[PDB]
Ligand binder design. Structure first.
Ligand code: EHI
Ligand code: MG
Ligand code: ZN
Length: 312
């Protein structure tokens, strides 16, 4: 049914926008991804039967957790689409192929627990993955689906370009570990301020792509206020579920994961915007000027949380 799916003409104009919310169109998400692939890469860059088989298998490998779910995957993929479409020339055909697949697969098989939980509580996954625990597992899940019968969408590529594309994917998924973002953004800010940033430099390229992955991962802060607030509910519901497990183990979780400290959510968001989000989209807008609407919408939601704090 996915190969026969067609996108409504009204969605065609609105999908191009940075602030587009996929929320209301759940039944259309697989077809929306296909549409986005064809517009960014071309109508023939993947075999349609293999692509539709890959997408539905990716969908199946997302769990029914409050936040890191199938919806989040498509939301991140859409924000990447808008970035790629507004900056199409700066990126190669292979980068466009890998980054959209990576965004859809970046949280594959997420359990709803942070990398800290798995490490501190000696979860099997943290045994084989030292740093960026879940992120390395997400890439491992992506390869596993690719290596299934009739799912290998890169099979028509040469062995040179096959190993090239999954390196883009690997680096992109690992970059979604927020722990690595803070250092990455500082370096990119430095490279820009000194006027020494170069897109032909491959280490610079992986870093810009890295910041792009974060920008897409956090893009719920770039939607219209009501969507932004509603997503926050899903985020904390997952955090609080992790905090409850720590409480059953006797340990008090950090206030972010403590449902009894939910009064400090507005100030918690305020902190997240000023320390994480605003800096992320500021540096991205500097490097890629067409991405400005992301920073504009993030600033608008910042003042909204400021408006929440002062009881307005
Ligand atoms: C909006 C969004 C996107 C992606 C990821 N995240 N992660 C968050 C937690 C924000 C947060 N919330 C608290 C907090 C602290 C004490 C009490 C209640 C909340 C602290 N922080 C940093 N927001 C997001
Ligand atoms: Mg993740
Ligand atoms: Zn994510």
């Amino acid at each position: 049914g996915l190969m026969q799916f067609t996108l409504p003409v009204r969605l065609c104009k609105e999908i191009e926008l940075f602030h587009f919310d996929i929320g209301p169109f759940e039944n259309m998400w697989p077809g929306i991804f296909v549409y986005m692939v064809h517009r960014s890469c071309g109508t023939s860059c993947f075999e349609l039967e293999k692509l539709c088989r890959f997408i539905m298998s990716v969908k199946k490998n997302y769990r029914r957790v409050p936040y890191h779910n199938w919806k989040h995957a498509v939301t991140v993929a859409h924000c990447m689409y808008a970035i790629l479409q507004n900056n199409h020339t700066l990126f190669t055909d292979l980068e466009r192929k890998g980054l959209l697949i990576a965004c859809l697969c970046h949280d594959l098989d997420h359990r709803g627990f942070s990398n800290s939980y798995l490490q501190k509580f000696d979860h099997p996954l943290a045994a084989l993955y030292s740093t960026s625990t879940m992120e390395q597992h997400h890439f491992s899940q992506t390869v596993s689906i690719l290596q299934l019968e009739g799912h290998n969408i890169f099979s028509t590529l040469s062995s040179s370009e096959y190993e090239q594309v999954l390196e883009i994917i690997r680096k992109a998924i690992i970059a979604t570990d927020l722990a690595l973002y803070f250092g990455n953004r500082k370096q990119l800010e430095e490279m820009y301020q000194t006027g020494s940033l170069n897109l032909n430099n491959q280490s610079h390229r992986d870093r810009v792509i890295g910041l792009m992955m974060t920008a897409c991962d956090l893009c719920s802060v770039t939607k219209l206020w009501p969507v932004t607030k509603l997503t926050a509910n899903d985020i904390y519901a997952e955090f609080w579920a992790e905090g409850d497990e720590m409480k059953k183990l006797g340990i008090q979780p950090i206030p972010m994961m403590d449902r009894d400290k939910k009064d400090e959510v507005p100030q918690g968001q305020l902190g997240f915007y000023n320390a994480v989000a605003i800096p992320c989209y500021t540096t991205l807008t500097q490097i890629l000027p067409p991405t400005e609407p992301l920073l504009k919408a993030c600033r608008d939601n910042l003042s909204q949380w400021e408006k929440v704090i002062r009881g307005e």
